Paper text:
SAP05 is an effector from a plant pathogenic phytoplasma that mediates the degradation of host transcription factors, including SPL and GATA family proteins, by hijacking the 26 S plant ubiquitin receptor RPN10 independently of substrate ubiquitination. Specifically, SAP05 folds into a tight globular structure consisting of a parallel five-stranded β-sheet (β1-β5). Although SAP05 carries a single domain, it utilizes two opposing surfaces (hereafter referred to as Lobe1 and Lobe2) to interact simultaneously with TFs and AtRPN10, forming a dumbbell-shaped structure, in which TFs and AtRPN10 have no direct surface contacts. In summary, SAP05 bridges the TFs mainly through electrostatic interactions with a hydrophobic core, whereas the SAP05-AtRPN10 interface comprises predominantly extensive hydrophobic contacts.
It should be noted that, unlike other types of zinc-binding domains, these two zinc-binding sequence motifs are not interleaved, thereby forming a unique plant-specific TF called SQUAMOSA promoter binding protein (SBP). In the SAP05-SPL5 structure, both subdomains of SPL5 participate in the interactions with SAP05. Likewise, for the C-terminal subdomain’s contacts, a bidentate salt bridge is created by the Arg121 and the Asp106.
Residue numbers in the entry:
A (entry chain A): 59 to 124
B (entry chain B): 36 to 135
C (entry chain D): 37 to 133
The structure:
Amino acid sequence: GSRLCQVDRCTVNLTEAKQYYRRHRVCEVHAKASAATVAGVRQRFCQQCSRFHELPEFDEAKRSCR
Amino acid sequence: EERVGDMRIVNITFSDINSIKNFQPFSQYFDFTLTGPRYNGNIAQFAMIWKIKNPPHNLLGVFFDNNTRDDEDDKYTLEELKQMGNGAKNMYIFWQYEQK
Amino acid sequence: ERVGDMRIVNITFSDINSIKNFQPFSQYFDFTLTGPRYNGNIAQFAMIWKIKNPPHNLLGVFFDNNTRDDEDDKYTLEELKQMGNGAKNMYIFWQYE
Ligand SMILES: [Zn+2]
Ligand SMILES: [Zn+2]
């Protein structure tokens, strides 16, 4: 939904969160999670792009894409 | 305190936090709804959200102009943050002026 | 950062416009002048004397007390630091980057 975290199983409402999280449609926990299922596939929130990529776009133990 | 390798440390002084709101292009990285000085873990608008640990009482914020770093509240002091440029070429440190 | 009893205080600003909301330094600047100036005495708008061969990004010098020679294109920043003449603080105003 428009006001919610974009992780498929997450319903956290972000209308009261910091603008950074509401802008990018992700709750704080899933922004830092090693992996979450987003749009049906395993993804990780890229610190550098502020958006999820699929896991193969990250090197080992990295929070931003290469 | 002045340079950490390739990263320049830039101390900029303001009358108060409201005067930063006129400072382009950096004002868009602040989150002016928040209390206490923050640093950014990345480059996005409103990305300076992480509470600096035990800050100097006149520190207003820290902006790293590139790259990424660990992003947590009340965990990193200003001196620790000066080691966390992680590739940033500039670390801008915003201060409120006080008269001695 | 010290010349005897004079503290030398370097302050770096976003731009010259940021100084205009700075009490007490705004009223000692003369914003009609261009190029960095220093004051020969304490009075409103007294920062009028041209600093000689000023460095890049220098915006002005304010001595917070006493008097000194007052003249254009004569005293470098370095010599001004010897010219406090009893001033307790010499504020040196810089533009960032
Ligand atoms: Zn979530
Ligand atoms: Zn990325």
